[PDB]
Design a protein around this ligand. Structure first.
Ligand SMILES: C/C(=C\[C@H](C)CCCCC(=O)O)[C@@H]1O[C@@H]2C=C[C@@H]1OC(=O)\C=C/C=C\C=C\[C@H]1O[C@@H]3C[C@H]1O[C@@H](/C=C/C[C@H]1O[C@H](C[C@H](O)[C@H]1C)[C@@H](O)[C@@H](O)/C=C/CC/C=C/C2)[C@@H]3C
Lengths: 105, 225, 31, 249, 158, 1114, 95
């Protein structure tokens, strides 16, 4: 994958320096290399709920249709993130409050 | 229908550049006038520019003029920054002439004394020669509309002269922008500001007027014959 | 944050709490 | 542990899971025995202190190594209370700030140390008395208000007892909790305790902080409500000379 | 809603909500500027169900000239979770927000709302326009770095 | 438009009835169309049996029994609508044919009894409860069985869990402490296990025989020599231990509860309890945690053999593993039927105690059923459910899909057996298994993420609450037509091949067959495959299934577009999307929002009101259209006729459309001409740019309906009365009120307009004379009654579309004590897209309209057509919802090619196909331009040029040949409206289906200056004339402290809230062009000081000279 | 279009908040006498655009900042006592 990812990025450079996806990612605009990979190259090694990695990778990339099993294997992640954010957004200004109650004066 | 005739403010410097602000225009009309004027403004106003140069000793822009502290390139450019007004309203061609001292720095107001043709910016740093410096020049001036590169016209006054890019257009910059203004409950009415920079030659306001006249003229062609 | 020395009367405590606090979000909670 | 849980662990001075042992004493290291039972000795001339490890523990001093007063033997996190007594209050301050930042940094965040510093110092606001001069011998006292006695009874009214104290690492909450002004103290988990107490003693506020004056609806003691600026008057050319001509009357 | 049009120190404010936000001020202005014999009669013609007379918008506008408002979004996490602005009288019912100010507010044009407030006393105005005007708070107080940076679209163009 | 269908895999099974979960559940709990002889347990049938050989006090001396024979479901006293009108719950009385016997004999079967009222489910799946349609969401809990688990408080050790069916036994946990002691934890009481084991007769030496030499574990369970005693004495001590107080030897009594009989521990009649307790544990079982009356002494059946596996897991040979609590072979589904039935249990449970209570109070000679039964413990226990249980939501009615999807929801929370909103993280994650059953995508974004979920399209909950997915048995080579739905556990033992997999005719075609087994993705030999996916549609929800190119959308943004569709409000010109997925017709079908034929006949009558069809011979029915009725969420459900006068009807085909329906297919929005490019900062961040064109064409416009309600109550001061005779009111204010006080229909209502007039009495003083003298002399008759009418609240208003009146008395009507008559006014409102509204697409590209442009602006194709909405590219790359991009491309085909598309999920269009269609399109689109007299104007040539410098067109091709190049890559040369000059470098343009969501600026946006201050809290709150007042949170208090904003903060703390003195001084200053403040003393301060005095405590306020101040002067 | 001349204004004072306090305290007096109090008068006064010509800007604080910016006013931290400050104040046409 790191071979595909690096490759998908030196292609833009060598042919297509004004390609949007690139131009954007390159400039401050939008996108980071992590995202251009899933879009153009290859999604990679998915990990299972019990941490352990699948030894079958997601071989496709959004551009090309990725496939139900790949979609399912890679949907575990797309829940582990949603649960993570729902915890660090849960507590409003938990720590700020603590920090203000000491500091304020 | 509704909305009264707008107010047209003009604020100017007096040769180059003036702002022009016709105010409450209905939504849309801002651009509708603004842009076509700019097009006309940058494209179709009649002026005059250096179009061909002969330098005694040396063809090619890419040569060595000796005794000249500068070189052919900076001269060509320098020349393009020259403006000359044709007093003689019939003529459509003129040739200018230069004769250069030793230790001296040649301004544009050191041209051939010639009456009938009016150098508008007498300063301007044309060239500079060293002790024992020799420069003679035959510079052609032409009536015209846009910006016309040499690679197009190819004006050959001599069989040794190099031809320059023509910027015959007294307007050098047009920048316009419509913002919203308010009349009563209506906060989103067009307000077009027109910013015209012309080389001290044709005024911005004159520029604008000419520009309008061209579009109107043209608009009268939409008359069934 | 106007890149000069502080003004007397800067409520620095709260400013700190906020500074340390606002990023509190984009840190992951997995511990 | 990582993330926000770490930052609390830190801001709250919390004796963590995997305290990963530190040596209390200077001296020379000696790892002994594998799989059966794993223990590590840091024995200098004289004392031989012994530090029994989980066995699973991934210790990070190999045999023979010389060691430091409070140096980590084992890896893992470090107890900020064990660090206080073994190696003082500054070393503490310096651990807290540099660890808290170890996370914001590790993630993506960039903030200035001073913020964390400002807070950390407050975690060190108070100290407990050992052998007093005036008050009861056990009480916790603000670092500064003890100098209001230490360098007071050793200058003008010199004598008695300089009041000996101990450095006291207060977690962010606990420290916020023990905060002089009752108005502020009231807004925390048990308002009664505060008032009951503060009523018995003719306790007074003075209202130094902000949490105070917002409670009362008073004009915050900061910014434009800073004593250093709010008294500023503006007199106006002709107003000044005309005000001068009724002063000598 | 995004307001690309504004300058850094300006605002949304639908006419309706300016008017009301500012009502009492307008009443005295209406009187000050003829139509409206008394402030109690100024109150009256502002009530007659709907349809507002141009002079009053013109008054309102004068009322506002150089006063600022406070905008504020969602989780106010640092001081830049409030910013002052000069209100612009604008069409429609959404508040309009300068694109450069977004980052600090963490505003995202997909359903966000923001409340607005009017500092009343001259002090509090002063307070807002010197200390909290969006355009005096250009750099992060956390890391002295610019917080009002070009971004997501401006960059693209440049 | 002709439709082009995409992709292979021929759908072997159509989607099952969808609302199946709900509708078929109830049925089998209410065998109402089955003779009371059959009725094989479960449901209400069993819930009686579970209770109803009911004895009385003492064990075989006093007579009277009372035995259930059969129940009878009554008949609905009010039509499905009367209910929703009169404010009632669609019910039917329930009767029990009970029978009470005696000691002198006397079989009295009192002709049924009324035990209570049973709420009936609709065709829908939904209920009606006190008006208002409620849905009971199906919950999930631990499927009963025996489990073990690791021990969170003691590492390297284990607990043991004996968990029975909900409301059918207690929770028994077994865990060994640092003492060694094994301890039973039941009903939150903990005694040494041994004590029980002693009772069940195990002997100090039998235990070691059975439970020794793995671990020194017995050694702990032992030592209680003291109570390794007389099994009877054991029993006494354990009864004293479980219920402190009564110390006798009838301890068999209670010990019979957590033992034998179908009173408690009935972990199944002979199902998923016994079964799974056998395989995990040491086999051979009956049905209760132990058996009692073996002859008069208990005989253990589960306790010890569990303990075995408990010890045999604290060292233990392989095979004695832990248990996956999150496996769906460990997760059960309580559907409506069962919860409703479980509630009968609570009812009948209570009804029994209060029979045995009346068996004791009464003379046994005359006691009858009817004289023993009360009819209120069944009611109050089952009224309570449908009304007050968490599981009984309202009914998400925004659009057809939203509703449909509600019924298929699954949640781990709910009542008792349910985790709180502060536990469970291992639960939340999409565990392997969910595949085909639950959705890896539908969950709400925060808080209850994973605690709630969607049932999958093909999934089916079964027999005992396990979800089952369809599969295709492949007889070693050939893909058989036989379809096998199978458990989450009955799956971990096979090798199942994917549907994406090819085939030749009826058999596998490739040599390296993809498939999974247990969980791992596995590559497998064809002959080495056993089963096959029926479709990829198996894997996702109904809504997640509607996203035409899901394959290409990152799963996060997919979940955004899966919901968000559920927010999509119905539209007047609602239209089925250009690029569909298949279920769009069926979703509308199973929702029954659309009206469909009954039996292929012929339409006779057709108007905005009725469609009446003559069904072949079978009489004639008239189908009334619900028309501009108001959905729970204020949406406007309204049917439109889709069929002409005198036409033959297709079997069961669209007679009428629903609210979000276009000729039978789903229509959550509009498809509309889009261009993905930046505008001028107007589509910054997520904002959309609109063309006014859309408003002129009344596109994104929708009809919302508010609902206002007023009550008239009786009062210590006299009756609240609904007159139009409202005091002082000008006969112009009353203008729209009928002679009753209630607005006319079709009345146009602005804020502050009487909607329902109502005078209340109120005794706010007595007028002292002079005033009374003045009153007559100048005419106006002093009145006894205040105004208090209804009136339209600030912000609202529209057209009056219907009234509703309910009077205390009136037949079925039952309003609450005090309330006497209730009025309901309904107010419609066309809406229309607006800056501030939010449009979304199927791939989760949400965003607010931030500028409407007049068509003069707006990028336009060369032919002249303008686009409609300008969507920003910068939106795409970071979220990875590439499907939207593809969708625009196929769509662009459509526009020109004149067709819509059905592209299945992971089976729809490929680029090869898409670009073939774009080819065909350009050939007609450009064929026109030529055939009309044109081709490739300077503007396109100037673009096409730099377009190849951009390596986007093939060099050495004709501008026409280069145009196609681009049109095929899906981009086009757009033209700037403002200035005819072409956008430099091509733009992708096309048709994208876009929805209007539940939110609108109309409902938001409020601004106050002053007014209504509460008399309780004294800070502004509520607004009869002017509204609102915004909260200044503690977070904002910080910000102001962070800025130096002293006075500004103090302003927010005094003069714009409680500080009466202050605000008044301030507003009196603004009126008069004065500076405002000098606020004397923060009211806050005074208040606190006084609120302190009240509690003793002096609170001296003192200046710097330390003397006192008096912040009061009075 | 940030506050007009504020960079200069911040530099005039020690602690910035002082600036606010002066602006406020001035915009105060400048209001409590109809602007018959200006130092800047001639053709310095700030003004307003309209459906009408240039009218006197009615913003005290806006005036206050323009005023201050000309060195024509003074910041007494403790110069001239508060008792005498409200004295000669209500004099030059106050009511
Ligand atoms: C949080 C919750 C119910 C909430 C009111 C709604 C869920 C919020 C999640 C979300 O929408 O993101 C819980 O729900 C149940 C049991 C315990 C919990 O109770 C709870 O924590 C809280 C409340 C539980 C029940 C409340 C019932 C009553 O409260 C009000 C009147 C009664 O019905 C409520 C209507 C709820 C329907 C919702 O429907 C959703 C959209 C809106 O949230 C609502 C229209 C739809 O998207 C629908 O598909 C979602 C259904 C949620 C399924 C969850 C079932 C388990 C309404 C809010």
């Amino acid at each position: 994958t790191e071979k595909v990812t690096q490759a998908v990025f030196k292609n833009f450079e060598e042919n297509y320096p004004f390609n949007p996806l690139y131009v954007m990612a390159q400039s401050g605009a939008r996108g980071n290399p992590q995202q251009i990979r899933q879009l153009c190259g290859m999604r990679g090694l998915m990990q299972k709920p019990s941490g352990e990695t699948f030894e079958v990778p997601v071989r496709s990339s959004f551009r090309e249709g990725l496939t139900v099993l790949e979609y399912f294997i890679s949907s575990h992640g797309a829940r582990k993130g949603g649960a993570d954010t729902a915890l660090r957004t849960a507590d409003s200004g938990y720590l700020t409050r603590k920090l203000v109650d000491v500091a304020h004066e | 229908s509704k909305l009264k005739a707008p107010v047209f403010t003009a604020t100017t410097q007096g040769d180059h550049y003036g702002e022009f602000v016709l105010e409450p225009l209905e939504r849309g009309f801002g651009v509708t006038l603004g842009n076509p004027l700019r097009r006309i403004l940058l494209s179709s106003i009649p002026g005059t520019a250096v179009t061909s140069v002969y330098i005694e000793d040396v063809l090619h822009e890419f040569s060595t003029i000796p005794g000249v502290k500068e070189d052919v390139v900076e001269i060509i450019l320098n020349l393009k920054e020259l403006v000359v007004r044709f007093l003689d309203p019939k003529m459509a061609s003129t040739t200018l002439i230069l004769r250069a001292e030793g230790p001296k720095e040649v301004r544009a107001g050191d041209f051939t004394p010639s009456a009938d043709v009016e150098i508008m910016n007498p300063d301007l740093h044309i060239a500079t020669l060293e002790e024992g410096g020799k420069l003679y020049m035959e510079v052609r001036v032409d009536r015209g509309v846009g910006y016309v590169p040499a690679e197009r016209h190819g004006i050959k006054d001599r069989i040794n002269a190099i031809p320059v890019d023509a910027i015959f257009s007294p307007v050098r910059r047009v920048a316009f922008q419509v913002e919203d203004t308010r009349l009563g409950q209506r906060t989103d009415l067009d307000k077009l500001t027109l910013r015209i920079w012309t080389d001290g030659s044709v005024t911005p306001l004159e520029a604008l007027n000419q520009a309008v006249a061209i579009l109107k003229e043209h608009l009268n062609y939409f008359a069934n014959p | 944050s106007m890149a000069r020395p502080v003004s007397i009367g800067e409520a620095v405590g709260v400013v700190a709490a906020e500074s340390i606090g606002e990023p509190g979000t984009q840190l992951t909670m997995r511990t | 542990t990582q993330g926000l849980p770490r930052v609390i662990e830190l801001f709250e001075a919390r004796r963590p899971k995997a305290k990963a042992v530190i040596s209390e004493i200077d001296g020379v290291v000696r790892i002994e025995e594998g799989e059966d039972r794993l223990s590590v000795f840091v024995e200098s001339e004289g004392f031989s202190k012994e530090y029994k490890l989980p066995k699973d523990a991934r210790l990070l001093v190999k045999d023979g190594d010389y060691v430091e007063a409070g140096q980590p033997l084992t890896r893992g996190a470090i107890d900020p209370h064990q660090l206080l007594e073994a190696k003082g209050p500054e070393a503490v301050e310096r651990y807290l700030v540099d660890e808290i930042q170890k996370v914001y940094r590790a993630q993506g965040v960039k903030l200035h140390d001073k913020h964390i510093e400002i807070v950390v110092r407050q975690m060190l606001k108070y100290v407990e008395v050992t052998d007093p001069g005036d008050s009861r011998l056990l009480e916790g006292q603000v670092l500064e208000k003890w100098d209001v006695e230490a360098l007071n009874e050793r200058l003008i009214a010199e004598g008695k007892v300089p009041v000996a104290w101990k450095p006291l690492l207060m977690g962010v909450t606990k420290s916020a909790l023990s905060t002089k002004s009752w108005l502020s103290a009231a807004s925390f988990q048990n308002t009664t305790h505060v008032l009951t107490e503060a009523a018995i003693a003719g306790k007074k506020d003075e209202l130094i902080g902000l949490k105070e004056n917002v409670i009362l609806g008073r004009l915050i003691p900061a910014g434009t409500g800073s004593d250093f600026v709010r008294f500023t008057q503006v007199v106006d050319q002709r107003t000044l000379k005309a005000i001068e001509e009724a002063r000598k009357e | 809603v995004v307001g690309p049009q504004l300058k850094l120190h300006q605002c949304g404010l639908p006419k309706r909500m300016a008017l009301e936000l500012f009502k009492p001020f307008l009443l005295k202005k209406m009187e000050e500027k003829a139509f409206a014999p008394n402030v109690k009669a100024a109150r009256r013609m502002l009530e007659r169900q709907r349809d507002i007379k141009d002079e009053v918008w013109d008054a309102l506008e004068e009322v506002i000239h150089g006063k600022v408002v406070l905008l504020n979004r969602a989780p106010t996490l640092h001081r830049l979770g409030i910013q002052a602005f000069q209100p612009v009288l604008v069409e429609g019912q959404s508040i309009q927000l300068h694109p450069l100010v977004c980052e600090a507010f963490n505003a995202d044009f997909d359903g966000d709302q923001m409340a607005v407030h009017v500092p009343l006393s001259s002090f509090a105005q002063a307070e807002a326009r010197i200390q909290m005007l969006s355009a005096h708070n250009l750099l992060s107080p956390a890391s002295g770095e610019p917080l009002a940076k070009p971004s997501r679209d401006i960059i693209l163009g440049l | 438009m002709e439709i082009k269908r995409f992709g292979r895999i021929r759908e072997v099974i159509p989607l099952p009835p969808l609302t199946e979960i709900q509708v078929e559940s109830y049925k089998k709990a209410l065998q109402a169309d089955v003779p009371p002889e059959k009725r094989e347990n479960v449901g209400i049938q069993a819930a009686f049996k579970e209770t109803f050989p009911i004895e009385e006090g003492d064990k075989g001396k006093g007579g009277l029994v009372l035995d259930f024979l059969e129940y009878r479901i009554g008949d609905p006293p009010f039509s499905q609508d009367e209910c929703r009108e009169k404010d009632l719950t669609y019910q039917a009385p329930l009767y029990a044919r009970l029978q009470l016997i005696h000691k002198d004999t006397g079989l009295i079967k009192e002709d049924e009894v009324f035990l209570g009222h049973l709420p009936l489910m609709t065709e829908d799946g939904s209920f009606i409860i006190n008006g208002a349609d409620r849905v009971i969401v199906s919950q999930i809990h631990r499927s009963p069985g025996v489990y073990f688990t690791p021990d969170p408080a003691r590492p390297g050790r284990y607990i043991a869990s004996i968990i029975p069916l909900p409301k059918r036994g207690p929770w028994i946990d077994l865990e060994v402490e640092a003492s060694g002691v094994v301890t039973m934890k039941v009903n939150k009481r903990k005694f040494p296990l041994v004590l029980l084991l002693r009772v069940l007769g195990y002997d100090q030496e039998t235990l070691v025989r059975e439970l020794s030499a793995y671990g020194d574990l017995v050694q702990g369970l032992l030592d209680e020599a003291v109570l390794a005693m007389r099994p009877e004495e054991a029993m006494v001590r354990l009864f004293t231990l479980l219920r402190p107080g009564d110390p006798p030897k009838k301890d068999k009594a209670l010990a019979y509860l957590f033992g034998l009989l179908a009173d408690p521990k009935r972990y199944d009649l002979g199902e998923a309890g016994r079964y799974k307790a056998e395989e995990k544990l040491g086999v051979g079982l009956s049905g209760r945690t132990l058996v009692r009356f073996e002859d008069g002494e208990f005989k253990d059946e589960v306790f010890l053999p569990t303990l075995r596996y408990l010890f045999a897991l604290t060292a233990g040979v392989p095979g004695h593993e832990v248990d996956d609590i999150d496996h769906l072979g460990n997760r059960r589904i309580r559907t409506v039927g069962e919860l409703m039935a479980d509630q009968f249990r609570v009812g009948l449970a209570r009804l029994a105690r209060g029979v045995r209570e009346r068996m004791v109070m009464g003379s046994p000679d005359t006691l009858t059923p009817a004289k023993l039964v009360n009819s209120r413990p069944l009611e109050a226990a089952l009224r309570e459910f449908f009304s007050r249980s968490q599981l009984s939501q309202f009914k998400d009615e925004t659009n057809p899909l939203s509703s449909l999807r509600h019924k298929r929801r699954i949640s781990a929370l709910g009542p008792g057996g349910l985790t709180r909103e502060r536990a469970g993280f291992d639960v939340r994650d999409v565990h392997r298994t969910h595949y085909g059953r639950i959705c890896p995508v539908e969950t709400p974004e925060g808080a209850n993420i994973g605690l709630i979920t969607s049932l999958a399209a093909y999934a089916r909950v079964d027999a005992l609450g396990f979800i089952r997915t369809p599969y295709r048995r492949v007889k070693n080579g050939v893909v058989t037509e036989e379809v096998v739905y199978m458990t989450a556990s009955e799956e971990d033992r096979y090798t199942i091949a994917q549907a994406n997999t090819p085939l030749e005719g009826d058999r596998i075609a490739t040599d390296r067959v993809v498939a999974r087994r247990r969980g791992e993705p596995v590559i497998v030999a064809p002959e080495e495959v056993e089963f096959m996916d029926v479709s990829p549609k198996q894997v996702f929800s109904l809504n997640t299934n509607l996203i035409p190119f899901l394959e290409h959308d990152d799963a996060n943004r997919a979940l955004m577009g899966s919901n968000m569709q559920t927010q999509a409000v119905p539209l007047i010109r609602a239209q089925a999307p250009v690029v569909m997925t298949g279920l769009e017709e069926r979703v509308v079908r199973d929702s029954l929002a659309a009206l469909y034929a009954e039996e292929d006949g012929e339409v006779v009558k057709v108007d905005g009101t009725r469609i009446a069809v003559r069904y072949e011979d079978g009489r004639l029915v008239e189908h009334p259209l619900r028309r501009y009725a108001r959905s729970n969420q204020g949406t406007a459900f309204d049917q439109r006729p889709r069929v002409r006068v005198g036409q033959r009807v297709k079997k069961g085909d669209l007679l009428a459309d629903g609210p979000a329906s276009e000729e039978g297919f789903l229509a959550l929005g509009q498809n509309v001409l889009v261009a993905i490019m930046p505008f001028d900062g107007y589509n910054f961040e997520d904002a959309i740019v609109i063309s006014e064109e859309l408003l002129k064409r009344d596109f994104y416009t929708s009809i919302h309906i508010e609902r206002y309600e007023i009550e008239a109550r009786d009062t210590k001061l006299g009756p609240e009365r609904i007159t139009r005779d409202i005091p002082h009111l000008s006969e112009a204010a009353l203008r729209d009120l009928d002679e009753e006080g209630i607005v006319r229909i079709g009345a146009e209502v602005k804020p502050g307009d009487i909607l329902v007039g109502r005078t209340s009495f109120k005794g706010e003083q007595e007028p002292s004379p002079e005033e009374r003298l003045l009153r007559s002399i100048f005419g106006e008759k002093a009145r006894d009654v205040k105004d208090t009418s209804l009136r339209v609240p600030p912000g609202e208003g529209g057209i009056v579309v219907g009234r509703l009146r309910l009077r205390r008395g009136d037949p079925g009507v039952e309003l609450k004590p005090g309330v006497r008559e209730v009025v309901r006014v309904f107010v419609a409102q066309k809406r229309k897209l607006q800056v501030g509204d939010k449009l979304a697409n199927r791939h989760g590209n949400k965003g607010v309209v931030a500028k409407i442009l007049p068509v003069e602006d707006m990028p336009h194709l060369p032919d002249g057509t303008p686009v409609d909405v300008i969507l920003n590219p910068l939106g795409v790359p970071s979220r990875m919802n590439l499907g939207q991009i593809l969708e625009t491309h196929l769509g662009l085909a459509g526009y020109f090619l004149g067709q819509r598309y059905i592209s299945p999920v992971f089976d729809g269009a490929t680029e090869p196909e898409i670009k073939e269609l774009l080819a065909e399109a350009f050939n007609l689109y450009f064929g026109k331009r030529q055939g009309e007299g044109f081709g490739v104007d300077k503007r396109e040539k100037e673009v096409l040029a730099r377009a190849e410098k951009l390596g986007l067109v093939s060099p050495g091709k004709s501008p026409e040949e280069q145009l196609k190049e681009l049109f095929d890559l899906g981009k086009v040369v757009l033209y700037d409206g403002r200035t005819g000059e072409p956008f430099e470098g091509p733009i992708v343009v096309g048709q994208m289906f876009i929805m209007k969501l539940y939110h609108m600026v109309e409902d938001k946006m409020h601004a106050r200056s002053t007014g209504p201050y509460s008399l309780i809290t004294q800070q502004p709150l509520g607004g009869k004339a002017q509204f609102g007042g915004q909260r200044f949170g503690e977070m904002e208090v910080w910000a102001l402290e962070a800025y130096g904003a002293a006075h500004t903060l103090q302003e927010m703390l005094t003069i714009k809230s409680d500080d009466i003195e202050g605000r008044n001084a301030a507003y009196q200053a603004i009126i008069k062009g004065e500076d405002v403040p000098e606020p004397s003393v923060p009211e806050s301060f005074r208040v606190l000081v006084k609120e302190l005095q009240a509690l003793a405590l002096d609170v001296q306020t003192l200046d710097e000279k330390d003397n006192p101040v008096d912040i009061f002067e009075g | 279009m940030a506050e007009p001349g504020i960079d200069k204004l911040f530099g005039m004072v020690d602690s910035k908040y002082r600036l606010t306090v002066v602006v406020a305290k001035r915009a105060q007096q400048l209001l409590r006498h109809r602007f018959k109090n200006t130092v800047l008068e001639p053709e310095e006064r700030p003004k307003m655009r309209t459906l009408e010509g240039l009218y006197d800007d009615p913003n005290a604080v806006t005036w206050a900042m323009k005023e201050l910016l000309t060195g024509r006013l003074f910041f007494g931290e403790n110069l001239v006592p508060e008792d005498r400050l409200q004295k000669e104040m209500e004099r030059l046409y106050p009511t």
